[PDB]
Structures are given as C-alpha cells and as structure tokens.
C-alpha cells in the first residue's frame, strides 16, 4: 500500500545494529526497528561522497537520552540531557552533557569508522487499496520459436524473427495486402519482429501396398526437417 | 403430490424409467404457474417415448425462477443449478406459500451463495466446506470473515 523510505547516515561499525531485536547504542536511543520489521536493510559504502578532509561536524549519533526510544521515533528536540541530581537550566555543567556530538569520519579511517548510508524501506502490510494501477506483467521475448504472442493487444501465434522493416516512426500494428498481421513493433523497445506461420503443412503416408508389406513412409509437406529413422 | 422437498443445493433426483409414463396426469395434480418446455412441446409429450426421464425437485425464490433457463446466468444459475445449452425437457414451477411459509420463518431451505468457480451442467455438490473470504487461513470455524457457503 505505502512504503516509508527512511534514509540516514551512521558509523561504519553499526551496520548490523539496526535490526529486529538488537540492543545497540545507536539502536536503542535512536531509530529502532521492531521485532516485526518486514522491510530490508539495504545499505552501501559512502567513503567517497560523505568523506571530507576536515573535522566532519556534519553527523552525530544522539547517545545521551533520558529514556529508550520507541520504534520509528524521530526526536527533533535539543534539550540539555540531565544524568541525575544535577539540573542544568542554563549551560551544560560537568554532569550535564549535550545530546549531540561531532561524528568524525576521517578519510584515513578503515572499515569500521567510515560513513555508511543506510536506508530501510518500511513495507506496510495493512490490508488497504494497493497500487493505483497494479502489478505490470513482463516476459522476456523469445525469438525463433513459435510462441503465442499478445503485444499491446495484437494476439496471435507465430515465429517472431528479426526484421529489416524500418517502420515510419509512429506506427505499431503492421499488416499486409492479404490483411495478415505481419511485422509488430516491440511495445517496450523499438525493435520490429516479423511474424511467420507456425510451421504447418500436410502429412502424406507412402504405402507400397498391404499385400506387399507393411513398412510405410510419412511425408511432411512444407517442413525443413527441423520441426520433427531415415 | 409430495410434501417434503429438499433445498436448492440438493436434488433428490428419482430416475423414472422402465415404465410407460403418461404426461397427461401432471395437469390434474396441482395448478402450475410456469410451464417452460425447452426442446419439447407440452401437447406432444404423450406420443414421444423418451429413454431416460430424470426428475429433480428443489425450492427456489420467486425472483429466482427466471434464472432457470438453458444458458442463463445468475446467483442460482451458476452456483446451484447449471442447465446445459442443449437441454431438452420441461420446467414445472408452482407456488407453495401455503405449505412452506411459517409465521416465524422457515430456515430449512439453504442456498449456496458464491464459490471459487462455477458449476458445470448436471453437477451436484453437498460439501459443507466453509468459505474463506479474506487472506487469513480459516481452520474450519465460522468466525468473522469465514462465512458458511450455505
């Protein structure tokens, strides 16, 4: 019905911390996935885009929190965290700490401390109206082999081969004088496959006479010995 | 001239054969309200000696009588009784409100609503498999969305 795409950059050693049923320092006080996450953990390395030879004050990790975060909780507040018996109404004291800290991603750091971009696709499985259109069917084209074809509604059986029919740039059906629906243009691509009959003919049984013998031979009129003894 | 009649999903077909049937006494049994002889004619049923005379009986609603026709679709025409396109016979129907209607309602006549497919001509199914209307497996218990087909 609706997939929620949530993108965020994390450290290089916490790629597996964001998983169903995992107690991590960036998985409990931050974006948490529940035990019923029906999505994916698609992620990749970004040591080329998010890397910069500087202090890297772009990202943080939000460790200092008063309580555990609910799943899919986005806390935008910047209040001063209080550990205990030390209220800080002004600036953060010795016991009070800021809920943000620079995430230094140095380019010389190896695997484990590199910037990784992780995006989880929250697949909602609520019984509701699905896609406005519906699953598009798609099958690879087979060439020289009789296949029943239904392209954009041009239903018919035949061998779909490669054609030198440079179609004027706007047509699709392609018929003949005897009104046979020959060449058809690929609905998807701009290829033109001319159709042919599905190798039909006539069976003729040569018999020298039942009085003489019983060995007979069959003649398939109009067959190149490819569509099915000497 | 019977009193006990099954529902529409049941037929109780009695094969009348091996005996010389006369179609002239059926007009004196009870006043009928519908006489649809497809393929045959009511006037010439006497001289015609057919091989097998199948006789089924079932109770149906008044608004559902028009669905009993060769090559007809409907709720009681595709899931309860499918007549073939080459049907050669008569259709006898008559109202029985004076015998099958009690003041508190009679719930002894059952009809099948909808299946995964349509019934073929001349088929009878008495299976009571509870229908599954949804995506959740129903373990043979009538619940919220697991409705009985009858």
């Amino acid at each position, epitope marked *: *019905t*609706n997939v*929620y795409a949530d993108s965020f950059v994390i450290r290089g050693n916490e790629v597996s911390q964001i998983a169903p049923g995992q107690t991590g320092n960036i998985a409990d006080y931050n974006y948490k996935l*529940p*035990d*019923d*996450f*029906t999505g994916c953990v698609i992620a990749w390395n970004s040591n080329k885009l998010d890397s910069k030879p500087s202090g890297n004050y772009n990202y943080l990790y939000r460790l200092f929190r008063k309580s555990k975060l*609910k*799943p*899919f*909780e986005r806390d935008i507040s910047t209040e001063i965290y209080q550990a205990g018996n030390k209220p800080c109404n002004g600036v953060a004291g010795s016991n009070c700490y800021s809920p943000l800290q620079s995430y230094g991603f140095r380019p010389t750091y190896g695997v484990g401390h590199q910037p990784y971009r992780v995006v989880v696709l*929250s697949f*909602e*499985l*609520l*019984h*509701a*109206p699905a896609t406005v259109c519906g699953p598009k069917k798609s099958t690879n084209l087979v060439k020289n082999k009789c296949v029943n074809f239904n392209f954009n509604g041009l239903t018919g059986t035949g061998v779909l081969t490669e054609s030198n029919k440079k179609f004027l740039p706007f047509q699709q059906f392609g018929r003949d004088i005897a009104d046979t629906t020959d060449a058809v243009r690929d609905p998807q691509t701009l290829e033109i496959l001319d159709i042919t009959p599905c190798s039909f003919g006539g069976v003729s049984v040569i018999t020298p006479g039942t009085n003489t013998s019983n060995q007979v031979a069959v003649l398939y009129q109009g067959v190149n010995c490819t569509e099915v003894s000497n | 001239n019977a009193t006990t009649f099954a529902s529409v999903y049941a037929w109780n077909r009695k094969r009348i054969s091996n005996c010389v049937a006369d179609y002239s006494v059926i007009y004196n049994f009870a006043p009928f309200f519908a006489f649809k002889c497809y393929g045959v004619s009511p006037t010439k049923l006497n001289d015609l000696c057919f091989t097998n005379v199948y006789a089924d009986s079932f109770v149906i609603r008044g608004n559902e009588v028009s669905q009993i026709a060769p090559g007809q679709t409907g709720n009681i025409a595709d899931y309860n009784y499918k007549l073939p396109d080459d049907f050669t016979g008569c259709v006898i129907a008559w109202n029985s409100n004076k015998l099958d209607s009690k003041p508190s309602g009679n719930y002894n006549y059952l009809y099948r609503l909808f299946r995964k497919s349509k019934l073929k001509p001349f088929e009878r199914d008495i299976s009571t498999e509870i229908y599954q*209307a*949804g*995506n*959740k497996p129903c373990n043979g*218990v009538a*619940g*919220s*969305n697991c409705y009985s087909p009858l």
Partner: antibody
Amino acid sequence: QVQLVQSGAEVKKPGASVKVSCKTSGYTFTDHYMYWVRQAPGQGLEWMGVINPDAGSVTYAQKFQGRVTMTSDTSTSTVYMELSSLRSEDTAVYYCARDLFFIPAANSFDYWGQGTLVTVSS
Amino acid sequence: EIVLTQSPATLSLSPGERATLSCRASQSVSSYLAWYQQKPGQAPRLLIYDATNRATGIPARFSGSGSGTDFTLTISSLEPEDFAVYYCQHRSNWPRMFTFGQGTKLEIKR
C-alpha cells in the same frame, strides 16, 4: 495532555448509517495510528480496525468487511466512522484508541477516548 | 482465528493478596500479547504491552510475565482501585487481526 474527545449519544434505525467523530489533541496527527473498538453491554471488545492519519490506507475488521468506512482528515485532525445497515446486535459503546508505536508498527492501544452509546430502536 | 480463552473467568480474591489470571492461546504468541484493564463506567486502559515490559503510567504492583502459549499476570498487592475486568490481545504481524477474549472479573473476598 493527549485527550481524545468523542461524540455523545446517537440513536438510529435498522438499515441506516451513523456518523461518529473522535477528534485528536495534544499530539501531532501524522505519526500515531488510531483504532476503533466496540464495547457491548456485558460483552467485551469485538472488532479491530486501523485508520491512517496520512492517507486513506485503512484496514477494516473481518466481521464487517465492507459495511464500515473509516475516513481520515488532516485539516481538523478528526477521524470518522460510518457503520452502514445497523442491526439489533450493533447497539454498543464505540471507542477510539491510539497506539504506542508510530506509523509503520503497531503493538497495542494506549490512549482511549470516552465512548459513544449508539443504539438502534425507537 | 486465534480464540483467546480464559479458564477461570471469575477471580474472587481479597485486597492485599496476589492474583494470577491466565489467558492461553494456540499459536506462538510469546512476544505478541497485550494486557488491558477495563473499569466499569470508563474506557479500558493499557496494563501491560508486549507481554514482557511495563507500560507508562502503571504502578509497580502490576507485573506481567509469560512465554510460549501460557501467560499470566502477577499482581503484587490488590488495591480497591484494582478490582476491574482484564483482557488479553495478541498482535498479528502480517494480517491485522487484533482479537480479544472474554474478561476476568476481580471480586472482593468477604
């Protein structure tokens, strides 16, 4: 403080539709799901059903499955529930319940409303 | 569907003792269960969710536990404001099929 206000009393007739609203307050009506539960006199909770505050992606119960329409509205942050063809067994007290999780997941019901005594008779 | 059934359905005890109300099921609902509390004249409140942790705004006397297909609530000390009806609900993941049971009334022993 989050307080879900609902309607009051509502009488109906067999074969009709009752419109009952349950306005939200305190929290942003974009992140938390809502459920509509029925409490019958003497019985317990019967039907589930969730309404998405963002879009019309809702999920009705299995007993009704077609005779209830739960719409959404981000203008006044108020949900709606219109049960059609009320019978002599639908007379109960309808409640609106929120969820302790966010849009994707749903664990249970935490914030409830006040109820709406709907009856079907003269 | 998962027919949540409660065997006692009537827990007559005295204020001060401990209570154990059971609500079993068939499918594995070890991590999929919620506990409510419906007082007469108001709306049901959340008692214990996820069947393993404590909810918000709940006193320390309410302690829930259980795993597999057998669950029970372990109340520390009964109070006059605790006598009410409790229910149970499991949370199916793929199909939205939140069902309930029948309810257990807590009486006062005299």
